[PDB]
Write a protein that binds this ligand. Structure first.
Ligand SMILES: *[C@@H]1O[C@H](CO)[C@@H](O[C@@H]2O[C@H](CO)[C@@H](O[C@@H]3O[C@H](CO[C@H]4O[C@H](CO)[C@@H](O)[C@H](O)[C@@H]4O)[C@@H](O)[C@H](O[C@H]4O[C@H](CO[C@@H]5O[C@H](CO)[C@@H](O)[C@H](O)[C@@H]5O)[C@@H](O)[C@H](O)[C@@H]4O)[C@@H]3O)[C@H](O)[C@H]2NC(C)=O)[C@H](O)[C@H]1NC(C)=O
Ligand SMILES: *[C@@H]1O[C@H](CO)[C@@H](O)[C@H](O)[C@H]1NC(C)=O
Ligand SMILES: *[C@@H]1O[C@H](CO)[C@@H](O)[C@H](O)[C@H]1NC(C)=O
Ligand SMILES: [Zn+2]
Length: 597
């Protein structure tokens, strides 16, 4: 048993190196398909996966030759635990292959969607990224908005109903083979905490009132713009008017809903263009930010192998921005169809946060080369993006000119941040509440579409621009739903990124609550080695410890908390509550009529 724990350590040392290498090969094939969708690359990705799944199955089986639960070392027990978790790889060989073909079908459908120009039904090569997204973010013609919404959702959503259904059945069977109740519990296992769901319910209910105030004010402002025929006072907001295809963030309509329209509203897109920014510049600036904090510089493989602009050769590819770890040394990459905008600048930093995490933990053993939990991975880049979005940072890099930071410009910037950060929370909760409710069997197949729009109404108070029914199937019109990417990570990120940002700001000397000149919402952590250090301590851990331990490394705390995100927005809350009362703004909404059962 002592003898045995010593051999086990050697077994792990060696098997970890082998999984890195086999995964490397699967990652390269996935990369090739995602950057160039073809039948041939599909076949290749899916065959290499099939093979890696088969080997994982043998590894799981050989775990039972070791008395690992009897061992002394927490660390060895943790690695063995992690090797027992097969996920889809637990499926019979044939079911696994079917599942991969189902996943390919959906993701490739999403990526190849094209629609006809509203103004020209002969031009039929408009893609979400960038053509349809540009209209949704910029047009204030409600009818054009509605048209693109229907065209998109009909092709990206409804077209893959039968595929989505088989995926739920196979996902459910895979979870049961791992002895989880459903896919919901399989995802939740990543957070290592039996009360996790409850914890988020608690946090969500504490911020909901702020969301409802924001919702109410936006609805008021949209009525003055579009008039009462297009937006009602008491009903859900028509989602097509909120500047995003899924209404997940509303910051693209800030110019019509901002508190003080005569005071400055930060939008540096136009200046980025005026100064000749490219994608390459944007990523080099993101690099600069990380190295400024004494973190690790992008390696050369990054620059040689990343794809940072949409190919011009008319190939099909997944443009949904992503970051990739190849599981060797220093081979990390981003695939981003980058455009020169303010919000793409933030995305660049978002993505490079994943890359940094990968570089920070690449000396760990294979099974620890992932986030402390999924939410940690998503948060890293957003802590930087927070800084980058500040007027402070933006004047430093010359993108924001002639800005005066009076009380009214502060409220504008606060609100603008809230349109991305508070608004998102209900949206993000719903993506997984929906999927969970299907995975767990709580909704009947006859009710699957209206169950989606029900959640969206109940939690976000938004609805489709047109009537939908069980003849439509709208959920897979969101990337992550079509691609089988758990979404809760993003809700977790949006809470915990404030815990990290506040703590990083304190460490940098950029925030003191008792000093009016260092308010949280204008903290820049650029150049702070103090913040950098705290990051290094947490990120270098990988998944070597449960996530509270990784948090504790960063700032000493162990609990996921809503206190920070509220502390950030508290000045907005005060003002906004008062402004809604001042203007007699109706808060809340009636039940949507847009989904017919
Ligand atoms: C998900 O949960 C599943 C249960 O719902 C679970 O499946 C069970 O896993 C067991 C593996 O631990 C497996 O156990 C073996 O059962 C054999 C009996 O088989 C049939 O008879 C049953 C009873 O009447 C029927 O109901 C079943 O359908 C079966 O088909 C036994 O032969 C076998 O035994 C040997 O194995 C143990 C090994 O155990 C340990 O090893 C060390 C030594 O190496 C021991 O010292 C240690 O203390 C411990 O015992 C030996 O003790 C023994 O001498 C033999 O070598 C074994 O018990 C069980 O059949 C299976 N049941 C069911 C209902 O499926 C899945 O494993 C779970 N999945 C995941 C992913 O976790
Ligand atoms: C895309 O993949 C195919 C294989 O199906 C290959 O022959 C083709 O030339 C690739 N395109 C690019 C631009 O890499
Ligand atoms: C930066 O990190 C190094 C290790 O890479 C460390 O020894 C040093 O203290 C840090 N430097 C700064 C600027 O704090
Ligand atoms: Zn991300």
């Amino acid at each position: 048993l002592v003898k045995e724990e010593i051999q086990a350590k050697e077994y792990l040392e060696n098997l970890n190196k082998e999984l890195a290498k086999r995964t490397n090969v699967e990652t390269e094939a996935a990369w090739a398909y995602g950057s160039n969708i073809t039948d041939e690359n599909e076949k290749k990705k899916n065959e290499i996966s099939a093979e890696l799944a088969k080997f994982m199955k043998e590894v799981a089986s050989d775990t039972t030759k070791f008395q690992w639960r009897s061992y002394q070392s927490e660390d060895l027990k943790r690695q063995f635990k992690a090797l027992t978790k097969l996920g889809y790889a637990a499926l019979p060989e044939d079911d696994y292959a079917e599942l991969l073909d189902t996943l390919s079908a959906m993701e490739s459908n999403f990526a190849k969607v094209k629609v006809c120009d509203y103004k020209d039904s002969t031009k039929c090569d408009l893609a979400l990224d960038p053509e349809i997204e540009e209209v949704i973010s910029k047009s204030r013609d409600h009818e054009e908005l509605a048209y693109y919404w229907r065209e998109f959702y009909d092709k990206a959503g409804t077209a893959v109903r039968s595929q989505f259904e088989r995926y739920v059945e196979l996902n459910t069977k895979a979870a049961k083979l791992n002895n989880f109740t459903s896919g919901a519990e399989a995802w939740l296992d990543e957070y290592e905490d039996d009360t996790f769901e409850q914890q988020l319910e608690d946090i969500f209910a504490d911020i909901r009132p702020l969301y409802q105030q924001i919702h109410g004010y936006v609805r008021f402002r949209l009525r003055k713009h579009y008039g009462d025929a297009v937006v009602s006072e008491t009903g859900p907001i028509p989602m097509h008017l909120l500047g995003n295809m899924w209404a997940q963030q509303w910051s693209e309509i800030a110019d019509i809903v901002s508190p003080f329209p005569e005071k400055p509203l930060v939008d540096v897109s136009a200046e980025m263009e005026k100064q000749g920014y490219t994608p390459l510049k944007m990523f080099q600036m993101g690099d600069d930010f990380f190295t400024s904090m004494n973190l690790t510089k992008l390696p050369q493989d990054f620059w040689d192998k990343s794809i940072i602009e949409k190919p011009t050769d008319g190939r099909d590819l997944v443009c949904h921005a992503s970051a990739w770890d190849f599981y060797l040394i220093d081979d990390v990459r981003i695939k981003q169809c980058t455009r020169v905008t303010q919000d793409q600048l933030f995305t660049v930093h978002h993505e490079l946060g994943h890359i940094q995490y990968f570089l920070q933990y690449q000396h760990q053993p294979f099974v620890y080369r992932t986030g402390a939990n999924p939410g940690f991975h998503e948060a890293v880049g957003d802590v930087l993006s927070l800084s980058v979005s500040t007027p402070k940072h933006l004047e430093k890099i010359g993108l924001l000119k002639d800005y005066v930071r009076d009380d009214e410009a502060r409220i504008n910037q606060l609100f603008l941040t809230a349109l991305d950060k508070i608004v998102f929370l209900p949206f993000a909760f719903t993506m997984d509440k929906y999927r969970w409710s299907l995975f767990r069997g709580e909704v009947d197949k006859a009710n699957w579409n209206c169950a989606f729009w029900k959640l969206r109404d109940e939690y976000s108070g938004i609805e489709p621009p047109v009537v939908r029914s069980e003849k439509d199937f709208d959920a897979p019109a969101k990337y992550h739903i079509s691609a089988d990417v758990e979404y809760l990570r993003y809700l977790v990120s949006f809470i915990i990124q404030f815990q990290f940002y506040k703590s990083a700001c304190i460490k940098a000397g950029q925030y003191d609550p008792d000093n009016v000149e260092l308010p949280l919402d204008n903290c820049d952590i650029y150049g702070s080695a103090a913040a950098g250090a705290a990051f290094h301590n947490m990120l270098s851990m990988g998944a070597s410890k449960p996530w509270p331990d990784a948090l504790e490394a960063f700032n000493g705390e162990r609990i996921m908390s809503g206190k920070a995100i509220a502390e950030y927005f508290e000045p907005l809350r005060v003002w906004l509550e008062a402004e809604n009362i001042k203007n007699n703004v109706h808060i809340g909404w009636t039940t949507s009529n847009k989904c017919v059962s």
